Amino acid sequence: GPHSLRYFVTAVSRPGLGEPRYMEVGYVDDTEFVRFDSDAENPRYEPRARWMEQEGPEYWERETQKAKGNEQSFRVDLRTLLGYYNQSKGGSHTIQVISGCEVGSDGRLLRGYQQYAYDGCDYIALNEDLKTWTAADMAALITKHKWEQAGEAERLRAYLEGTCVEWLRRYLKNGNATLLRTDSPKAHVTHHSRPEDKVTLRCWALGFYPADITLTWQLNGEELIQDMELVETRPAGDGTFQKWASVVVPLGKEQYYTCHVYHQGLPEPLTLRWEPPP
């Protein structure tokens, strides 16, 4: 299947409260595996998955030195942006970056990412062609011009097609067994009183991994869309996810409704109803 290596980077200025806070977070196929956090005396790149612990001291050293370098580049970038937008020196600002590669089953690069945001808004992004930039506004056009002359796209293309692809392979040899983890949802229906002759049926999906899931309610072979309540998928905090979908139904008609649970760990979707306890 397809695989990805992406770094989510954040630099947050805090005028008077100290130096900007800098973070580098690595993800292999949506799972955090490494982290650098500047908010420390001797800050260091750290493993966030046990399969990364096997990398030797030279690896951790190189990544730490490189992250401290990037940190210093973003500290300058924060001052450069205040100028570009004509902002005062005493307000807190954010720079965020998503950088990385998506590779297919055949090892070829599917997508390269180099996306910047300033104060939570698109700033500049490398286009799919890996040759041109999309500047969101006037300030980003200054960056686009500078990077066009310096041949930045070409330098990034070399990283995305080379280093990124190659390092994703290395990380996958280490983490693949753990990364392919699939925990099927365990589902149950709860019953709750409503005013008058109505009741709520809440269909629960628990202990599942990955987070992608679909819960539906059916009545007379048709999926209920309007009047169906749901919660956004949420972490249990132990590595698994939770979700629920509920519907308001007539009292006495609980057995006419079926909940369906769709997940990658489910060859057959779960079908369940309200089961009144003994």
Binding site: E24, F74, L81, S99, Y116, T163
Partner: peptide, 8 residues
């Protein structure tokens, strides 16, 4: 391995 970012 993270890229070495260029200044904006």
């Amino acid at each position: 391995r993270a890229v070495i970012f260029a200044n904006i």
